[PDB]
Design a protein around this ligand. Structure first.
Ligand SMILES: O=C(C[C@]12C[C@H]3C[C@H](C[C@H](C3)C1)C2)NO
Ligand SMILES: [Zn+2]
Length: 397
């Protein structure tokens, strides 16, 4: 058993209990293409969110090969259909675990509403979608259709443990730093994890990071980049972006004056988006209504509208959204909600990498994770202890 529905009748975020064996339908199970490649079978777990149970050899023309030149390699991983089915069920299980918390519900909600801005036109009075913010969805008859999306969960590239949140860029615009946003691609695996040492209070213990926490870390990156408020990776050796995402006392090392300069910068960035929406008179993209799309982005950025239908940015409303995305949505805050053990700083991880399997509910539950209640794994985070609960963790190098 998987234990995907601990309470209720159906899963609360993921729309279907997908099997990889399930036939394509062109709606939530289909072969897709990322804007040369071979069509891959993907699954739509939620609105604007797709899952591709394949190793990432598509997004980067320099990483189209699973060749080994903190890391781990295995070119045989995620090659059989059984693994792809286990990957798929593992990811959906982590979403439900994340969505089982108040913080996770808010984060996922913010992500879905964070539709990438329509700013692909050269006419400043014309709204146009950006091609890289879409995927081609093959139908049963064999025809394409362009579908917009916000988030894609895909398998890791050559280096398996190296999880990251990346997206396609613009030759002129910086979609992740101008407030627009772009379709985020998260390289992730629910079949692996990394370790960290912790003196619990004998000697220090060897624990493993809850994969739910790690996925949440990447989703926070996505939230930043979907609303185009991510920090430039030049700001650092650990970047400010990673330090903000981790949260806790880590993010406090960024001086408050620097924070105010950022917050005011994106406040004006959202203002430019408001002015663009006001000058929008035409729209390219057939059926898509201009009035409907203006409302979509009014909803997204929480813009005010007067009697004459003019959009504008409310000050204390922006600060609410900004604080939510940057200060409330942190890895540290998720650790508190999950009530699990985690490293106290972003870089406080060892080189240890473990093979896991969170799908069986005898191994991992939506409510508790590894630390199963009513057992000996509920005390002192024994479920995350690689020594005690060794049956759940296989040491790798
Ligand atoms: O934060 C990262 C890098 C790392 C993600 C996971 C946690 C640590 C160790 C590994 C796996 C790389 C940082 N990506 O966005
Ligand atoms: Zn990160």
């Amino acid at each position: 058993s998987s234990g995907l529905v601990p309470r209720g009748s159906h899963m609360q975020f993921v729309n279907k209990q997908f099997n990889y064996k399930d036939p394509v339908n062109g709606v939530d199970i289909a072969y897709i293409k990322i804007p040369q490649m071979q069509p891959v079978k993907a699954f739509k777990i939620h609105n604007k969110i797709w899952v591709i149970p394949e190793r990432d050899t598509f997004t980067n023309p320099e990483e189209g090969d699973l060749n080994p030149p903190v890391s781990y390699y295995d070119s045989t991983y995620l090659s059989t259909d059984n693994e792809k089915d286990n990957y798929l069920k593992g990811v959906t299980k982590l979403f439900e675990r994340i969505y089982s918390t108040d913080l996770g519900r808010m984060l996922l909600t913010s992500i879905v509403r964070g539709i990438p801005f329509w700013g692909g036109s050269t006419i400043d009075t014309e709204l146009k979608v950006i091609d890289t913010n879409c995927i081609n969805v093959i139908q049963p008859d064999g025809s394409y259709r362009s579908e917009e999306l916000n988030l894609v969960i895909i398998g890791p590239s050559a280096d398996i443990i190296q999880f990251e949140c990346k997206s396609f860029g613009h030759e002129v615009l910086n979609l992740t730093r101008n407030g627009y946003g772009s379709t985020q691609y998260i390289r992730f695996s629910p079949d692996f994890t990394f370790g960290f040492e912790e003196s619990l209070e004998l000697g220090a213990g060897k624990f493993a990071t809850d994969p739910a926490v790690t996925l949440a870390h990447e989703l926070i990156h996505a939230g930043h980049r979907l609303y185009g408020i991510a920090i430039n990776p030049n700001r650092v050796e650990v970047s400010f972006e990673e330090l903000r995402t981790f949260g806790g006392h880590d993010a406090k090392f960024i001086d408050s004056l620097q924070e105010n300069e950022f917050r005011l910068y994106y406040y004006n960035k959202f203002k430019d988006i408001a002015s663009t929406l006001n000058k929008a008179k035409s729209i390219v993209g057939t059926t898509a209504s201009l009035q409907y799309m203006k409302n979509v982005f009014k909803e997204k950025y929480l813009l005010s509208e007067d009697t004459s239908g003019k959009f504008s940015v409310d000050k204390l409303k922006f600060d609410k959204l900004y604080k939510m995305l940057t200060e409330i949505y942190t890895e540290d805050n998720f650790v508190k909600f999950f009530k699990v053990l985690n490293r106290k700083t972003y870089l406080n991880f060892d080189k240890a990498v473990f093979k896991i399997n969170i799908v069986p509910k005898v191994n991992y539950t939506i409510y508790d994770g590894f630390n199963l209640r009513n057992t000996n794994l509920a005390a002192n985070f024994n479920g995350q202890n690689t020594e005690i609960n060794n049956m759940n963790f296989t040491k790798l190098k």
